[PDB]
Design an enzyme around this catalytic site. Structure first.
Site, PDB file in Angstrom:
ATOM      1  CG  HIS C  41      -1.002  -8.566  -1.628  1.00  0.00           C
ATOM      2  ND1 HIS C  41       1.201  -9.513  -0.948  1.00  0.00           N
ATOM      3  CD2 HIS C  41       0.231  -7.596  -3.074  1.00  0.00           C
ATOM      4  CE1 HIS C  41       1.738  -8.604  -2.363  1.00  0.00           C
ATOM      5  NE2 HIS C  41       1.295  -7.949  -2.545  1.00  0.00           N
ATOM      6  CG  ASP C  90       1.236 -10.222   1.821  1.00  0.00           C
ATOM      7  OD1 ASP C  90       0.349 -10.817   1.043  1.00  0.00           O
ATOM      8  OD2 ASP C  90       1.499  -9.281   1.332  1.00  0.00           O
ATOM      9  N   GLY C 190       5.560  -5.971  -8.927  1.00  0.00           N
ATOM     10  CA  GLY C 190       5.653  -7.729  -9.853  1.00  0.00           C
ATOM     11  C   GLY C 190       6.423  -8.404  -9.252  1.00  0.00           C
ATOM     12  CB  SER C 192       4.046  -9.277  -4.902  1.00  0.00           C
ATOM     13  OG  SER C 192       3.869  -8.351  -4.103  1.00  0.00           O
ATOM     14  N   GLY C 193       5.366 -11.959  -3.777  1.00  0.00           N
ATOM     15  CA  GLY C 193       4.957 -13.398  -3.235  1.00  0.00           C
ATOM     16  C   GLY C 193       7.129 -13.705  -3.280  1.00  0.00           C
TER      17      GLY C 193
HETATM   18  C1  LIG Z   1      -0.160   1.676   0.810  1.00  0.00           C
HETATM   19  C2  LIG Z   1       0.530   1.304   2.037  1.00  0.00           C
HETATM   20  C3  LIG Z   1       0.936  -0.565   1.685  1.00  0.00           C
HETATM   21  C4  LIG Z   1      -0.325  -1.114   1.643  1.00  0.00           C
HETATM   22  C5  LIG Z   1       1.253  -0.226  -0.380  1.00  0.00           C
HETATM   23  N1  LIG Z   1       2.232   0.415  -0.582  1.00  0.00           N
HETATM   24  S1  LIG Z   1       2.308   1.581  -2.239  1.00  0.00           S
HETATM   25  O1  LIG Z   1       0.803   1.365  -2.783  1.00  0.00           O
HETATM   26  O2  LIG Z   1       2.806   2.557  -2.319  1.00  0.00           O
HETATM   27  C6  LIG Z   1       3.122   0.095  -2.846  1.00  0.00           C
HETATM   28  C7  LIG Z   1       3.005   0.403  -4.766  1.00  0.00           C
HETATM   29  C8  LIG Z   1       4.164   0.504  -5.050  1.00  0.00           C
HETATM   30  C9  LIG Z   1       4.669   1.039  -6.676  1.00  0.00           C
HETATM   31  C10 LIG Z   1       3.505   1.023  -6.699  1.00  0.00           C
HETATM   32  C11 LIG Z   1       1.728   0.548  -6.666  1.00  0.00           C
HETATM   33  C12 LIG Z   1       1.120   0.513  -7.602  1.00  0.00           C
HETATM   34  O3  LIG Z   1       0.510   0.265  -7.041  1.00  0.00           O
HETATM   35  O4  LIG Z   1       1.218   0.970  -8.931  1.00  0.00           O
HETATM   36  C13 LIG Z   1       2.270  -0.144  -5.515  1.00  0.00           C
HETATM   37  C14 LIG Z   1       1.441  -1.407  -0.186  1.00  0.00           C
HETATM   38  O5  LIG Z   1       2.190  -2.027  -0.035  1.00  0.00           O
HETATM   39  N2  LIG Z   1      -0.169  -2.132  -0.936  1.00  0.00           N
HETATM   40  C15 LIG Z   1       1.322  -3.813  -1.324  1.00  0.00           C
HETATM   41  C16 LIG Z   1      -0.477  -5.212  -1.829  1.00  0.00           C
HETATM   42  C17 LIG Z   1      -2.412  -5.000  -0.880  1.00  0.00           C
HETATM   43  C18 LIG Z   1      -2.843  -5.544  -0.671  1.00  0.00           C
HETATM   44  N3  LIG Z   1      -4.010  -5.383  -1.464  1.00  0.00           N
HETATM   45  N4  LIG Z   1      -3.581  -6.088  -0.277  1.00  0.00           N
HETATM   46  C19 LIG Z   1       1.692  -3.714  -2.254  1.00  0.00           C
HETATM   47  O6  LIG Z   1       1.470  -2.987  -3.811  1.00  0.00           O
HETATM   48  N5  LIG Z   1       2.816  -5.414  -2.249  1.00  0.00           N
HETATM   49  C20 LIG Z   1       3.634  -5.077  -3.294  1.00  0.00           C
HETATM   50  C21 LIG Z   1       4.508  -4.230  -2.925  1.00  0.00           C
HETATM   51  C22 LIG Z   1       5.898  -5.012  -2.981  1.00  0.00           C
HETATM   52  C23 LIG Z   1       7.017  -4.769  -2.477  1.00  0.00           C
HETATM   53  C24 LIG Z   1       7.228  -3.536  -2.357  1.00  0.00           C
HETATM   54  C25 LIG Z   1       8.092  -2.853  -2.007  1.00  0.00           C
HETATM   55  N6  LIG Z   1       9.662  -3.972  -0.943  1.00  0.00           N
HETATM   56  N7  LIG Z   1       8.981  -2.130  -1.553  1.00  0.00           N
HETATM   57  C26 LIG Z   1       6.009  -2.830  -2.543  1.00  0.00           C
HETATM   58  C27 LIG Z   1       5.232  -3.191  -2.234  1.00  0.00           C
END
Ligand SMILES: CC[C@@H](C)[C@@H](NS(=O)(=O)Cc1cccc(C(=O)O)c1)C(=O)N[C@@H](CCC(=N)N)C(=O)NCc1ccc(C(=N)N)cc1
Ligand SMILES: *[C@@H]1O[C@H](CO)[C@@H](O)[C@H](O)[C@H]1O
Ligand SMILES: *[C@@H]1O[C@@H](C)[C@@H](O)[C@@H](O)[C@@H]1O
Ligand SMILES: [Ca+2]
Ligand SMILES: [Ca+2]
Ligand SMILES: [Ca+2]
Ligand SMILES: [Ca+2]
Ligand SMILES: [Ca+2]
Ligand SMILES: [Ca+2]
Ligand SMILES: [Ca+2]
Ligand SMILES: [Ca+2]
Ligand SMILES: [Ca+2]
Lengths: 191, 142, 254
Positions: C41, C90, C190, C192-193
């Protein structure tokens, strides 16, 4: 396959066996145990029995709280067990009156300090070695009218009517406890 | 037990339940009181469950009410000490003591392996780096 | 990283910083001098595929030192089954245009064999997650690499212990939860990955990738990571393959 259920802890003097259901049919099991922050350790690998001895694991620290789970094989299906704190929950075995020596108008009743499964320095620690001050023995005696005595050690020094005969029965007790506070009454012994 | 005319004699715990097997009634004739008799009968008639000699591999049986407890030798465990702690050299059991990779083998014993950049030591279970910077190791701490 | 601590410089030597157009983008994990494992992602909205940079030996985003090594990302391989904007599969394998130099501050994390990871590492209670992500839900990102120790959970327990959400994503066999549901510690957007590294008998292994979750450290929710053990073969077959023409590559999975 079907997830195990009714996971129960059978523990006496720390001898701790986990039992469960049902009678496996085309399915075997593997148990895992751990403390809330430790790693998961596997036990009784692919057994067909519906029990698993976890004594050697829980005696490593009888004051820890363990959680066990049973995997099912024809992530795999499993079922968590209730949490188990040996020190607070292991049943107290049936005591044994070791002897009683009379001296004039008094009697010394001695309670055998039974051994537990807790190993230490190549030996089995007694119930006293483990519980120390948390353990007491209550005496239930009568002139062969009810009478009772309590001791923080393994002996009772009581009074008695010269000539008459007495019978005794003892119980192990861990006052601080809530559940499994007392053991079953020991066999009856008469002087 | 009851022999001809002995019942004319007062009750005696020794002569009746110790030197012989006594029935509940004979027991009730010595203690008289109901509860006292029951408190005595529960253990007296319970029967020693250690008679089967259930504890295996040199274990020690400890009698209890309608049950027993087995104390095993170091190398043993299990309700009746039937489990050999030395017969668990399979991979799913603590990685078979292998430091890195473990591979089961039917009949024979399991064998241990290592990740690239490491080699299996002679103990047959440990791995040692074969490069300056093996994966998973932290230089400023080694 | 929410509720964690700074990773002493050099103690997270496999952490990778991913940049796009020089801007911070995501984390990553070095598994050899030429390949980096990250999240898929992380490339959902990338446009300048020639502007992807991977930095190793990083620590303080505000001070440059000689431990830093930059490399253009020559290739981004994502599973053909991954769907932008979604959560399943992912994962991403990045081929650096030029190998990085292994040093006291730049070292790869071991990619474990599938069974070792499923039968052993998967039961090591704690593992480390790290990155320069948000220090709070919706908060700002970290300047210094943060690290956090989180407990792993089998999926059955994760679901049972989590609060249901409006048609939330399912936790598949390609994922696993780790963290706490009391709203105190977890990885974040942030991060992520980034790696979810497991320590086992003197060696650290890659077991997960920071992927998704309900916000960050939300009460009644756990962090979700990509179950890397499910991609071992996929990763190994790809690393022995020849580079493709374009940057982006969608490889079949299984
Ligand atoms: C809808 C449910 C879900 C798919 C979505 N949840 S969220 O939106 O609550 C994540 C989030 C958390 C905090 C801030 C933001 C933001 O966008 O500002 C977003 C979500 O997780 N979306 C994904 C990307 C989806 C994509 N574009 N392919 C994402 O935000 N992943 C990053 C991430 C990594 C770790 C954690 C953790 N350990 N917890 C949380 C988030
Ligand atoms: C000895 O007796 C006990 C009584 O419960 C039994 O459980 C054992 O199986 C037997 O060997
Ligand atoms: C009872 O305990 C077991 C462990 C062995 O030591 C036996 O020899 C003993 O009788
Ligand atoms: Ca008689
Ligand atoms: Ca008689
Ligand atoms: Ca009689
Ligand atoms: Ca006789
Ligand atoms: Ca006699
Ligand atoms: Ca009668
Ligand atoms: Ca009679
Ligand atoms: Ca008995
Ligand atoms: Ca820097």
């Amino acid at each position: 396959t079907v997830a195990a259920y009714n996971l129960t802890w059978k523990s006496t003097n720390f001898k701790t066996i986990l039992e469960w259901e049902p009678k496996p049919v085309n399915q075997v099991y593997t148990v895992q145990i751990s403390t809330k922050s430790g790693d998961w350790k596997s036990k009784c690998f692919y057994t067909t029995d519906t029990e698993c001895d976890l004594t050697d694991e829980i005696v490593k620290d009888v004051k820890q709280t363990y959680l066990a789970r049973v995997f099912s094989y024809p992530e795999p299906l499993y079922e968590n067990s209730p949490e188990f704190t040996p020190y607070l929950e292991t049943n107290l075995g049936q005591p044994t009156i070791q002897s009683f020596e009379q001296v004039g108008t008094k009697v010394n009743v001695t309670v055998e300090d039974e051994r537990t499964l807790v190993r230490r320095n190549n030996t089995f620690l007694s119930l006293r070695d483990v519980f120390g001050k948390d353990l007491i023995y209550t005496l239930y005696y009568w002139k062969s009218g009810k009478k009772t005595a309590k001791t923080n050690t393994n002996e009772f020094l009581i009074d008695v009517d010269k000539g008459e005969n007495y019978c005794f029965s003892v119980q192990a007790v861990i006052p601080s406890r809530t559940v499994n506070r007392k053991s079953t009454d020991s066999p009856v012994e008469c002087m | 037990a009851n022999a001809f005319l002995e019942e004319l004699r007062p009750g005696s715990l020794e002569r009746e339940c110790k030197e012989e097997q006594c029935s509940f009634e004979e027991a009730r004739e010595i203690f008289k009181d109901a509860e006292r008799t029951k408190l005595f009968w529960i253990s007296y008639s319970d029967g020693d469950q250690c008679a089967s000699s259930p504890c295996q591999n040199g274990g020690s049986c400890k009698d209890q009410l309608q049950s027993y407890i087995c104390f095993c030798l170091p190398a043993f465990e299990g309700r009746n000490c039937e489990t050999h702690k030395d017969d668990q050299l399979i991979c799913v059991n603590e990685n078979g003591g292998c430091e890195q990779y473990c591979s089961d083998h039917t009949g024979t014993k399991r064998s241990c392996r290592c990740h690239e950049g490491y080699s299996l030591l002679a103990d047959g279970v440990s791995c040692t780096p074969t490069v300056e910077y093996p994966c998973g190791k932290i230089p400023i701490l080694e | 990283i929410v509720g964690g601590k700074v990773c002493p410089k050099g103690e997270c030597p496999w952490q990778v910083l991913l940049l796009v157009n020089g801007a911070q983008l995501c984390g990553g994990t070095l598994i050899n001098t030429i390949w980096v494992v990250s999240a898929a992602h992380c490339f959902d909205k990338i446009k300048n595929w020639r502007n992807l940079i991977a930095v190793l030996g990083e620590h303080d985003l505000s001070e440059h030192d000689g431990d830093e090594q930059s490399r253009r990302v020559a290739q981004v391989i994502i599973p053909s089954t991954y769907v932008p904007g979604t959560t399943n599969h992912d994962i991403a394998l990045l081929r650096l245009h030029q190998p990085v130099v292994l040093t006291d501050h730049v070292v790869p994390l071991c990619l474990p064999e599938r069974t070792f990871s499923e039968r052993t590492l998967a039961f090591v209670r704690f593992s480390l997650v790290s990155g320069w992500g948000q220090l709070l839900d919706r908060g700002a990102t970290a300047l210094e690499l943060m690290v956090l120790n989180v407990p792993r959970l089998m999926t059955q327990d994760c679901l049972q212990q989590s609060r249901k959400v409006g048609d939330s994503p399912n936790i598949t066999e390609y994922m696993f939860c780790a963290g706490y549901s009391d709203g105190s510690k977890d990885s974040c957007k942030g991060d992520s990955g980034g790696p979810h590294a497991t320590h086992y008998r003197g060696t650290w292994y890659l077991t997960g990738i920071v992927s998704w979750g309900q916000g960050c450290a939300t009460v009644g929710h756990f962090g979700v990571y990509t179950r890397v053990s499910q991609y071992i073969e996929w990763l190994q077959k790809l690393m022995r393959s020849e580079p493709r023409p374009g940057v982006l590559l969608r490889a079949p999975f299984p």
